[PDB]
């Protein structure tokens, strides 16, 4: 039936024709190469250097599971062509996430601001929520640091540096 | 530190996924042995209450295996569906299997077991 | 076949809509062929009320294909129908009428759109002056269901009182 | 051959339905099993497949840049959804009774055959004039005042 073969590539498990007429191979490659980035993510976002990089790494797995949740849910056994069309409006988005990561990569504030400029660059398109949900959790630990003392316009840059040391100085008094 | 054996003649499309589920069992066979040992009096009044509060989670891990078997009778439990259900357990039983191996490495009892819980969802 | 091949090579939404329904009758017959005796002289006489309706289109469309400006190709087409219907004044009339409404839908839209949003047929000549003087006057205002009224009149002034409000 | 065609109309070409980079989808030559009169209707049917392939190839390529081009393709798949869904259905009807011929399959497309052609030049004007920026929200609008109700 071959549908349980193609559907088991988005998960990463190898199959009889997936290693690691006759035109179906061209059709197969369009769903095949989708799988090669899914595996290329777990190899990249498996660890639990930088604290903000961990949260962004911890936010990514909050998304892939949904991609694993959508699959293995709707189709018991559907038409072969249905698979290619169903996973098009979603599959291409998976390949976009490869341009974002590597599959070097900044860290610290340099990353929390780089991901921000990816919003305005591609705001109105369908990539607004997914990037936002990442930025909304990729800045979670950084707020805590800011929650202690309590490019971008330098009129406030140097002020933040002193707005914290005062709080860290009153804590010892 | 437990090692497992699966099968000489099994589908390769299964064994690669089996080895993705076991790290919650091997990380469990080292917590249940930490409870049944560090409960001995000759370990202080801290290595005790650490083993008690480390037991309530084991109880909630036994309920999560019960609700899977009762859901297995209706056949609604495929192998692919399993790898997603235990994810809250693969993260918790990975934390405790790291404290129970770092409190016994350097023999700690008393305050030095309360420091390690202050440096270490 | 020539009548239907040329149309397929070629307002269309009305023509296209007619073909789907016509195709269903032909497709249905094919069912009774695979699953009663059927021969030539039977399928033809069964298709009499269709091969009749089709011959009309070969003459109605012939005047919509023999022609360059975009305003004369659309005026001369839309006027051919209203002339060809008065010749046929029943199933052939139901076709041309249902073919008419779906082709005058553009004008009835812009005419309304002009009203609310602000070489000559003597049919409307006795009142034409009251139209232009209302059309242009309406356009200078925004910068600062008529067919559904004529038909109810047949059951039991629409264009003039409307004008009087606009100029007023 | 039915399920063979319903894939050719999906974007997968094969031996019966060869693919050419310039012309488009078309039947290779005469086939003994089938009649020699059908070799035409298929060619009339492929004039639709060529549109979907040249569509999805452009949709994937994303080509020029700008969000208003990204969103245009993002929306361009939505209008193209009823085409796919109406194609999945054809297989179900053929799975029931095995007495349906290409005539009925050709008849089912009906609406898609008169829609793609008018929504083909809108893409061609973009890739041939480098329509960059918000100027798309007019080039698509100037063609939105068309007469064809479906368009």
Curated annotation (Swiss-Prot), chain B:
It is found in: Cytoplasm, Cytoskeleton, Microtubule organizing center, Centrosome. Ubiquitously expressed. Changing residue 55 to C: In CDCBM15; uncertain significance. Belongs to the TUBGCP family. Component of the gamma-tubulin ring complex (gTuRC) consisting of TUBGCP2, TUBGCP3, TUBGCP4, TUBGCP5 and TUBGCP6 and gamma-tubulin TUBG1 or TUBG2. TUBGCP2, TUBGCP3, TUBGCP4, TUBGCP5 and TUBGCP6 assemble in a 5:5:2:1:1 stoichiometry; each is associated with a gamma-tubulin, thereby arranging 14 gamma-tubulins in a helical manner. Gamma-tubulin at the first position is blocked by TUBGCP3 at the last position, allowing 13 protafilaments to grow into a microtubule. It is linked to Cortical dysplasia, complex, with other brain malformations 15: An autosomal recessive disorder characterized by global developmental delay, variably impaired intellectual development, speech delay, facial dysmorphism, microcephaly, and varying degrees of cortical malformations including pachygyria, thin corpus callosum and subcortical band heterotopia. Most patients have generalized seizures. This is Gamma-tubulin complex component 2.
UniProtKB/Swiss-Prot annotation, chain C:
Widely expressed, with highest levels in heart and skeletal muscle and moderate levels in brain. It is found in: Cytoplasm, Cytoskeleton, Microtubule organizing center, Centrosome. It comes from the Eukaryota. Component of the gamma-tubulin ring complex (gTuRC) which mediates microtubule nucleation. The gTuRC regulates the minus-end nucleation of alpha-beta tubulin heterodimers that grow into microtubule protafilaments, a critical step in centrosome duplication and spindle formation. Belongs to the TUBGCP family. Component of the gamma-tubulin ring complex (gTuRC) consisting of TUBGCP2, TUBGCP3, TUBGCP4, TUBGCP5 and TUBGCP6 and gamma-tubulin TUBG1 or TUBG2. TUBGCP2, TUBGCP3, TUBGCP4, TUBGCP5 and TUBGCP6 assemble in a 5:5:2:1:1 stoichiometry; each is associated with a gamma-tubulin, thereby arranging 14 gamma-tubulins in a helical manner. Gamma-tubulin at the first position is blocked by TUBGCP3 at the last position, allowing 13 protafilaments to grow into a microtubule. This is Gamma-tubulin complex component 5. It comes from Homo sapiens. The chain holds residues 321 to 704 of 1024 of the full protein.
Curated annotation (Swiss-Prot), chain D:
Coiled coil: none annotated. Ubiquitously expressed. It is found in: Cytoplasm, Cytoskeleton, Microtubule organizing center, Centrosome. Transmembrane segments: none annotated. Component of the gamma-tubulin ring complex (gTuRC) which mediates microtubule nucleation. The gTuRC regulates the minus-end nucleation of alpha-beta tubulin heterodimers that grow into microtubule protafilaments, a critical step in centrosome duplication and spindle formation. It is linked to Microcephaly and chorioretinopathy, autosomal recessive, 3: A disorder characterized by congenital microcephaly and chorioretinal dysplasia associated with poor vision and nystagmus. Variable ocular anomalies include microphthalmia, retinal folding, retinal detachment, optic nerve hypoplasia, absence of retinal vessels, round areas of chorioretinal atrophy, and attenuated electroretinogram. Most patients have mild developmental delay and mild learning difficulties. Belongs to the TUBGCP family. Component of the gamma-tubulin ring complex (gTuRC) consisting of TUBGCP2, TUBGCP3, TUBGCP4, TUBGCP5 and TUBGCP6 and gamma-tubulin TUBG1 or TUBG2. TUBGCP2, TUBGCP3, TUBGCP4, TUBGCP5 and TUBGCP6 assemble in a 5:5:2:1:1 stoichiometry; each is associated with a gamma-tubulin, thereby arranging 14 gamma-tubulins in a helical manner. Gamma-tubulin at the first position is blocked by TUBGCP3 at the last position, allowing 13 protafilaments to grow into a microtubule. This is Gamma-tubulin complex component 4. It comes from Homo sapiens. The gene is TUBGCP4.
